[PDB]
């Protein structure tokens, strides 16, 4: 079921230096909560400054939903250490609050009055806060409190140069885009390996509640015995409302047209919420997507946007720069929600996705890759589980398939280790591959176990105390203070540069 990648892998070993220079970025989301596990009600910590403009730390959907963002970097350890510094500092400046260690909320009711993210009185600030008011009315606040880790990855220019030789910058920027869509297509096909290894939401609270055979634990949580990531299921951070959009990943102009056409596409269900009600705006528009950001795909095209420019516009201007892997649940066994084993595995898998051939895929061919994903999401650890090629009959045993993939991955790993020196990548392949015959080693089995034997509050507490005792390693306090001061200015500056009133800006 896994494609032959002999030729591309041969090319790679003949061109080892094509992998030197990989760049990475991490986004990690987490809920601020009280020691009793309830949602924190305080505002965005003052030591963090403006969330609107802050470089490293900001807010996602809710004002209590922190997001930590590492600046793009090519050193794994440095990046993860930088991420920990952001945690360390925040944990020493939110009083007695602490972070939620899991993707799923445990003590948040549906309809719970949850403060939207606030971004002050600027037109951009109010626009973002309004986007979120719209999300709340559409999907509900509860779902938008679901937290995840996003893995951001780019291959070096030297990769493309070794593939294509000397060419025009118009041609080369196109090749890059095509390269990344190929990656995306392979990710849709084979990316279910991610939930299977690192999925960490086999359980959920009552609030999230189908004919699925849920069971219970003494702590009051509902779970499926073989599930990996319900965050990715219809019950979690859903994109079902969006499955009719016909967006494809074959070509840059097509991708963008479908995505622009999706912002202009009326939805019947959202009209009913209404755009304006009793003087209070409730959403940006009544369309399937309010803006491009609302595309809840498991991976997406990307280019850092210039000022005022939209995601789609950057893409057309400079082509695809990097890809954003979005399918990672929070790592409950790491105080920073993500670890070096996962980062290293995603390096190997993303590189492999760039190497393997990926036939063009229609909208309905893409919808068909979901069947294996769903299998893994809802019952990935079930003994005997089989997978198929698309919508076809399941025939291939999951362990055999993962092993097949991993023979290729160890080869990529050998190349990466021979550049950086050491054996770290190869060692990660040896650890993870054992998970296929032994699903109890996966994240979803490990945390399911711990939830039955007793969790979210206990881990949060342990992770708070561990973090506060830890000195910063890369940044200093003065760095955090200067960034806070400077973000607060950037916000004031935006608040004073507005010439038109919020109302005219929109239209």
Ligand X SMILES: CC[C@H](C[S@](=O)(CC[C@H](N)C(=O)O)=NP(=O)(O)O)C(=O)O
- What residues make contact with ligand X under the rule CB under 6 A? 27, 29, 60-61, 67, 132, 135, 144, 146-148, 150, 237, 293-294, 326
Tell the residue number behind the tokens 């409190």, with chain if given: 145
Smaller CB separation from ligand ADP, 133 or 347: 347
Q: Say which entry of Mg ion, ligand ADP, ligand X, none residue 154 contacts (CB below 5 to 8 A, set by partner kind).
A: ligand ADP
Smaller CB separation from ligand X, 60 or 483: 60
Smaller CB separation from ligand X, 97 or 294: 294
Cα-only R_g, the chain: 22
Closest approach, Cβ 74 to ligand ADP, in A, equals 9
Query: What are the start-end ranges of the E strands in 388-494?
Result: 396-397
User: For residue 254, which of 265, 266, 245, 267 has the smallest C-alpha distance?
Assistant: 245
Q: Say which entry of ligand X, ligand ADP, Mg ion, none residue 71 contacts (CB below 5 to 8 A, set by partner kind).
A: ligand ADP
Closest approach, Cβ 328 to ligand ADP, in A, equals 12
End-to-end CA distance of the chain: 50
Query: Which residues of the chain form contacts with ligand ADP (CB under 6 A)?
Result: 23-27, 69-72, 150, 152-154, 304, 321-322, 324
- In the range 379-438, which residues lie near Mg ion by CB under 5 A? 404
Closest approach, Cβ 173 to Mg ion, in A, equals 23
Which residue's Cβ lies closest to ligand X?
Answer: 148
Query: Which are the contacts of 79, defined by CB distance < 8 A and separation ≥ 6?
Result: 24, 25, 26, 70, 73, 343
SS3 216: strand
Q: Say which entry of ligand X, ligand ADP, Mg ion, none residue 404 contacts (CB below 5 to 8 A, set by partner kind).
A: Mg ion
Chain-centroid distance, C-alpha 49: 24
Q: Say which entry of ligand X, Mg ion, ligand ADP, none residue 294 contacts (CB below 5 to 8 A, set by partner kind).
A: ligand X
Query: Which are the contacts of 407, defined by CB distance < 8 A and separation ≥ 6?
Result: none
- In the range 27-46, which residues lie near Mg ion by CB under 5 A? 27
Beta carbons of 223 and 357 less than 8 angstroms apart:
no
Structure tokens at 22: 């990989």
Smaller CB separation from Mg ion, 2 or 51: 2
Q: Say which entry of ligand X, Mg ion, ligand ADP, none residue 22 contacts (CB below 5 to 8 A, set by partner kind).
A: none
Query: What are the start-end ranges of the E strands in 35-111?
Result: 57-59, 65-69, 98-99
By CB under 5 A, name the one of 28, 132, 138, 150 that touches Mg ion: 150
User: How many other C-beta atoms can be found within 10 angstroms of the C-beta atom of residue 330?
Assistant: 28
């Amino acid at each position: 079921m896994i494609p032959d990648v002999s030729q591309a892998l041969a090319w790679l070993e003949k061109h080892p230096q094509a992998l030197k220079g990989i760049q990475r970025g991490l986004e990690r989301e987490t809920l601020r909560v009280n020691a009793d596990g309830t949602l924190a009600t305080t505002g965005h910590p003052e030591a963090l400054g403006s969330a609107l403009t802050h470089k490293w730390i900001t807010t996602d959907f809710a004002e209590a939903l922190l997001e930590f963002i590492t600046p793009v970097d090519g050193d794994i350890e440095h990046m993860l250490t930088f991420m920990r510094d952001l945690h360390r500092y925040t944990a020493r400046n939110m009083g007695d609050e602490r972070m939620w260690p899991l993707s799923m909320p445990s003590y948040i009711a549906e309809g719970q009055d949850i403060e939207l993210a606030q971004y002050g009185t600027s037109n951009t600030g109010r626009f973002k806060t309004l986007y979120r008011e719209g999300l709340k009315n559409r999907y509900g606040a509860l779902m938008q409190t679901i937290s995840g880790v996003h893995y951001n990855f780019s291959l070096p220019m030297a990769f493309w140069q070794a593939k294509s030789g000397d060419i025009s910058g118009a041609d080369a920027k196109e090749k890059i885009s095509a390269g990344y869509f190929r990656v995306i297509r392979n990710y849709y096909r084979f990316g279910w390996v991610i939930p299977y290894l690192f999925g960490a939401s086999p359980a959920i609270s009552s609030s999230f509640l189908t004919s699925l055979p849920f069971e219970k634990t003494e702590s009051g949580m509902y779970y499926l015995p073989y599930a990996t990531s319900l965050r990715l299921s219809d019950l979690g951070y859903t994109n079902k409302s969006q499955s009719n959009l016909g967006i494809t990943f074959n070509d840059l102009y097509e991708y963008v047209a479908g995505l622009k056409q999706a912002i202009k596409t009326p939805s019947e269900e959202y009209a009913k919420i209404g755009i304006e009600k009793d003087g209070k705006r409730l959403q940006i528009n009544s369309n399937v997507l309010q803006i491009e950001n609302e595309l809840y795909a498991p991976i997406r095209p990307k280019r850092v946007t210039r000022s005022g420019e939209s995601p789609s516009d950057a893409l057309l201007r400079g082509g695809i720069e990097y890809i954003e892997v979005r399918s990672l649940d929070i790592n409950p066994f790491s105080p920073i929600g993500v670890d070096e084993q996962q980062v290293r595995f995603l390096d190997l898998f993303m590189v492999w996705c760039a190497l393997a051939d990926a036939p063009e895929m229609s909208s309905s061919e893409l919808a068909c890759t979901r069947v294996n994903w769903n299998r893994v999401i809802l019952e990935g650890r079930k003994p005997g589980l089989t997978l198929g090629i698309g919508c076809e009959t399941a025939q291939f045993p999951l362990p055999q398939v993962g092993k097949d993939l991993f023979r290729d991955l160890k080869r990529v790993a050998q190349t990466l280790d021979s550049i950086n020196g050491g054996e770290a990548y190869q060692k990660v392949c040896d650890e993870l591959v054992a998970c296929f015959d032994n699903p109890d080693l996966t994240f979803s089995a490990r945390i399911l176990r711990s939830m039955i034997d007793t969790t979210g509050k206990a881990f949060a507490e342990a992770y708070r105390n561990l973090l506060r005792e830890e000195p910063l390693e890369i940044l200093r306090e003065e760095d955090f203070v200067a960034e806070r001061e400077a973000s607060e200015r950037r916000q004031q500056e935006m608040e004073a540069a507005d010439t038109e009133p919020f109302a005219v800006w929109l239209e």
